[PDB]
Structure formats: C-alpha cells, structure tokens
Amino acid sequence: KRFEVKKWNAVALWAWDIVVDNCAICRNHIMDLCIECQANQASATSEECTVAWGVCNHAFHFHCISRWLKTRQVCPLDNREWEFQKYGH
C-alpha cells in the first residue's frame, strides 16, 4: 500500500453502571419506581422519577437521594460529599 498506519493514540472515555439491579437508599430497583412512588402514591403517571448518577459513580432513584439530601448530604456508600453527574440510566 501507499499509506500504512504505524502508531495510534485514541483516547477512550468510559462510564461504569453500579450494580444496576437495585437502590441502596429505598431497596427497590435501579429503576421500576421507588418507595415514594409505590407506597406514597399509586398513579406513578407522568413521573420523571428517574435514576441519579453521582461522581462517586454510585446510583439511586433521583427521588431517594433527594429525600436523603434533606438531613444528611454525604453519599451513604462511602463518605464523599457526592455531586450530580447524570440523570437517567
């Protein structure tokens, strides 16, 4: 051939999905609604009740970390103050 690639230097970005099967705050699921959307109300309609992603890469129902951010504010699965790096799965 006339031109052959020798070196390459791509940079590859990533995003881990923590145990996508439940929530550590209300113990229900990663999605499929929460305790404030199954027992609190039944309609569960028009509910952007979605998953929240931290910088520590843990995941909970948006609602369940918002209710946890009332009294405490430091992510229950480590100690990091916890940010908000995503919304949805």
Partner 1 sequence: VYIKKVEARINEEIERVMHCLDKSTEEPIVKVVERELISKHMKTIVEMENSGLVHMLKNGKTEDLGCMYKLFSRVPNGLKTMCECMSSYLREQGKALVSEEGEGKNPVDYIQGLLDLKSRFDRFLLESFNNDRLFKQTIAGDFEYFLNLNSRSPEYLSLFIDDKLKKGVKGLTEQEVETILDKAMVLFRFMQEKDVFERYYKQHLARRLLTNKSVSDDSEKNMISKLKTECGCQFTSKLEGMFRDMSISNTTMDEFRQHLQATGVSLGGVDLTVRVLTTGYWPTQSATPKCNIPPAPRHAFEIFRRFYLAKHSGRQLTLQHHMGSADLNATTRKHILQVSTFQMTILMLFNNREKYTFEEIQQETDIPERELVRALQSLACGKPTQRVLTKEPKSKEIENGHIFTVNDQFTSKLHRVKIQTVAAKQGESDPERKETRQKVDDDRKHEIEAAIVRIMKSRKKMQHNVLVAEVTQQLKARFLPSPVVIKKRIEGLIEREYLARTPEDRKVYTYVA
Q: How far apart are CA 58 and CA 52, in angstroms?
A: 8
User: If binding is defined by CB under 5 A, does position 51 make contact with Zn ion?
Assistant: no
Among 85, 87, 88, 89, binds partner 1 (CB under 8 A): 85
Among 39, 55, 76, 88, binds partner 1 (CB under 8 A): 55
Instruction: Number of residues interacting with partner 1: please give it, by CB under 8 A.
Output: 27
Q: How far apart are CA 31 and CA 80, in angstroms?
A: 23
In the complex with partner 1, which residue's Cβ is closer, 11 or 42? 11
Distances (CA, A) of 29 to 3, 8, 19, 21, 50: 52, 41, 10, 5, 11
Q: Is position 89 annotated in a ligand binding site?
A: no
Handedness of CA 24, 86, 14, 83 (dihedral sign): negative
Return the residues of window 2-31 that contact Zn ion according to CB under 5 A. 23, 25-26
Residues that bind partner 1 (CB under 8 A): 1-18, 55, 69-73, 83-85
